[PDB]
Write a protein that binds this DNA or RNA. Sequence first.
DNA 1: ATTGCAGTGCT
DNA 2: AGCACTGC
Length: 430
Amino acid sequence: GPHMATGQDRVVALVDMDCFFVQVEQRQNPHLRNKPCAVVQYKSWKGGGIIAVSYEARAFGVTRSMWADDAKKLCPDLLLAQVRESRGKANLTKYREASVEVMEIMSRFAVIERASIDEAYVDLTSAVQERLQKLQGQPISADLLPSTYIEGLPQGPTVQKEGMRKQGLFQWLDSLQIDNLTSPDLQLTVGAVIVEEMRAAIERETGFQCSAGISHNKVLAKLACGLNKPNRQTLVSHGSVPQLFSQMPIRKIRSLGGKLGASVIEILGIEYMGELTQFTESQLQSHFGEKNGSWLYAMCRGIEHDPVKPRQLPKTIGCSKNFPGKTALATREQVQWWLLQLAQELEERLTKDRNDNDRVATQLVVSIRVQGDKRLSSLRRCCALTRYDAHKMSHDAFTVIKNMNTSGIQTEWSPPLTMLFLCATKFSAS
DNA sequence: ATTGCAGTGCT
DNA sequence: AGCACTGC
Ligand SMILES: Nc1ncnc2c1ncn2[C@H]1C[C@H](O)[C@@H](COP(=O)(O)NP(=O)(O)OP(=O)(O)O)O1
Ligand SMILES: [Mg+2]
Ligand SMILES: [Mg+2]
């Protein structure tokens, strides 16, 4: 009762840009705005691989990983923007720089954890306390939450989307105890007000729209964000969790989308996150390990402690290229020419990173794939990264993998290489 | 013949 | 350290 932790100590948000690479290309080329369009990399094989899709195009069934030729079958008027190609490979610089634009805006409001190229977690606990003391027990107007959904509402004793949103918001705000500055529901609500302001700043200053989730931890904030994408934000309160989880497939919770989540379903014979509450912590630890079992016991009750890490920059800088089918690299000159292409992009990005961020990478990770291996990687070796020089990095990379050339004669490479990967890591201040 | 990125945890 | 797993 009084000693049962409820996991309501923090206010955490997750901001996730809407169809991000599409918005970057639509900002640049107004002809693509408000159209079914997609972003594709390469073009020769089946029209290119789609990596991002506008919401107008999703209505036709176009999805990521689809070949553009196939997407055109569902959406003949689909417009396409191509990822830049430099040195014979896709180059994501435009999207990395657009990401920096958004992350720098978010950092004005609170410390952020860069979770991917287009999403960040925000710890708003402190910002909420300061806004709460400034309000002075002032009620929160619905006009301050013009794009916010309250998950689970309306409920109890209009057939249009926006009417429902407002009805749920009104029920939430009517029930709110604005007199108590330690009320978790009030704290989430102020958090949502701040996230409205953050999202308005992102859109004003970049043109980009995004969705957000506001809750008490990262997993619930991420889950909340997806509930009303695009261009909306969703508040998931602690009280909303039992009903939300009662029909929520386990795989929807971050970190349970793969083999572990599949094993939870199979071993326990359950389907939904809420069903996990019927197991003891020791039972879950016995099946999934001490760490996973404790995490699951708390998470199915809406409780998680993983902190928002103060990290705005990526901690690795990597470049990779696949050589599928008949393009697999089969000669030494080939392997050496492509390692140089990769090393030259990496040098360009590393030099820019050092100037911008006052740090230097110290380790070079070299990874390859050989034809036949189903694994993403077939070998990974690390060597020292002492100079930002493409020719040196490419020469060193060749040195650590040259022993894998099984061909008796040097000039040939066997079995052929279907992937080259270079990654700079182990940053130190400079 | 998805591709090209990333971070965390195990051992 | 090298690898499996999981997420954009
Ligand atoms: N498997 C992949 N391979 C290459 N690029 C990818 C990728 N998955 C995503 N990207 C790139 C392209 C994506 O635009 C960007 C962000 O990833 P998301 O947030 O999963 N997808 P989006 O933001 O487009 O749509 P919304 O959030 O509205 O659902 O990362
Ligand atoms: Mg995302
Ligand atoms: Mg996104």
